[PDB]
């Protein structure tokens, strides 16, 4: 019962060698620049991640004017906080309401809002989540410890085009006059994908 196709299975024993060989070849031909590649890695290891989206959500929670702007134009909205670029060029923000619960997926591959959430986790890119999310949202969500009220509508957004989606979670109850910073700590990656809820105080 090892992992096989859920994204966490073991890579081939020689994978590192194959990668090292291609890299050397590409550098040798002058197609890639090692120094520039290190900067790319650093950017997604240390600079771009869910903390970005968290700041976006937190700000929308406390600032109604910003929220309105964000929902009208996601790209400009997230830019106000200095977030933008690859895989986030055309953002659409999905507002969770008492009537609607949003969650997104890329059934066709792995499309995901890089600038605000960083690179996707292995499970988001794998068959189990992608295959089932569009047919049985509740079944999948239950595996994440999240049960949606039966009367509450679930909206699954499939990222088939060049639009990129991020979920604006509902603000947890009992968080009055919380600072933007304290509110941001409640916003998990899952809560912004739609596969979870913000932490409750």
């Amino acid at each position: 019962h090892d992992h096989h196709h859920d994204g966490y299975q073991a890579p081939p024993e020689d994978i590192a060698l194959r990668v090292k060989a291609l890299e050397s070849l590409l550098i040798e031909k002058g197609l890639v620049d090692p120094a520039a590649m290190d900067l790319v890695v650093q950017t997604y290891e240390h600079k771009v991640g869910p903390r970005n989206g968290a700041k976006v959500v937190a700000k929308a929670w406390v600032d109604p004017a910003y929220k309105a702007r964000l929902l009208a134009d996601g790209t400009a909205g997230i830019a106000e906080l200095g977030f933008s670029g690859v895989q986030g060029e055309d953002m659409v923000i999905l507002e969770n309401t008492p009537a609607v619960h949003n969650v997104f997926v890329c059934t066709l591959c792995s499309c995901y809002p890089w600038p605000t959430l960083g690179l996707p986790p292995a499970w988001y890119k794998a068959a189990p989540y992608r295959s089932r999310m569009v047919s049985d949202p509740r079944g999948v969500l239950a595996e994440f410890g999240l049960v949606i009220p039966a009367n509450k509508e679930i909206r699954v957004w499939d990222t088939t085009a060049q639009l990129r989606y991020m979920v604006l979670p509902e603000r947890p109850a009992g968080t009055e006059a919380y600072s933007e910073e304290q509110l941001a700590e409640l916003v998990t990656r899952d809560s912004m994908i739609g596969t979870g809820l913000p932490t409750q105080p």
């Binding site: 994204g7 890579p11 047919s135 909206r155």
Partner: protein
């Protein structure tokens, strides 16, 4: 392409296992593979649509067995040969054929600027929009062997246009050197019942999919 990659609605893939406290990169080789993508895209060695379709064209078993970044590694070893940037020999030997004959476009000086800017697929002008939000539409039954973005589970199904996102590049043509053919992209809403049938559905649930203008027809 009706390939293994089109997973929407499939059974038998099992539970969604999720590693707790998962790192951005689980192995070092992943870092190399991941950082190669921007470097090669910047060179203009290939476009993102040809990239996706390269992955769609790997063996079904290899696609399932392979971890995510093996998918990418496959593209680099194969799509680069198809495009004639490398030879099968160069790619097999590991050793180049005539030395430093190109210059990397992605240099340290422009990394941040490039990553912060990206490349929108939105275009100024293209085909006129045939549909308005509220319109009932039916996804055309098409089965191209080439690259397409209308998921198999939507074909023939009827939905409601809920958003007109404006004009965008069409991947179907961009992936096969037939130009961008810009046209409108809509978000279409389908009911759970419409997609999966009376039994496998929930009354409140809906699925939204982004489809190009000529993917559709009036219901």
């Amino acid at each position: 392409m009706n390939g293994i990659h089109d997973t929407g609605g499939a059974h038998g893939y099992g539970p969604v296992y999720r590693e707790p406290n998962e790192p951005v990169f689980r192995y070092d080789w992943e870092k190399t593979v991941m950082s190669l993508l921007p470097a090669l895209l910047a060179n203009g060695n290939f476009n993102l649509d040809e990239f996706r379709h390269s992955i769609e064209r790997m063996g079904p078993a290899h696609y399932l067995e392979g971890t995510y970044y093996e998918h990418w590694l496959h593209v680099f070893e194969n799509l680069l040969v198809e495009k004639g940037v490398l030879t099968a020999t160069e790619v097999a030997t590991g050793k180049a054929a005539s030395g430093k004959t190109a210059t990397p476009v992605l240099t340290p000086a422009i990394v941040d600027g490039l990553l912060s800017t990206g490349a929108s697929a939105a275009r100024e002008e293209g085909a006129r929009a045939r549909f308005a939000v509220g319109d009932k539409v039916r996804v055309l039954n098409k089965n191209p062997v080439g690259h397409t973005r209308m998921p198999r589970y939507t074909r023939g199904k009827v939905g409601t246009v809920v958003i007109d996102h404006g004009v965008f590049v069409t991947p179907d043509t961009a992936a096969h050197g037939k130009g961008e053919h810009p046209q409108h992209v809509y978000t279409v809403s389908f009911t759970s019942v419409e997609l999966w049938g009376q039994d496998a559905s929930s009354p409140k649930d809906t699925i939204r999919v982004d489809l190009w203008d000529d993917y559709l027809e009036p219901a």
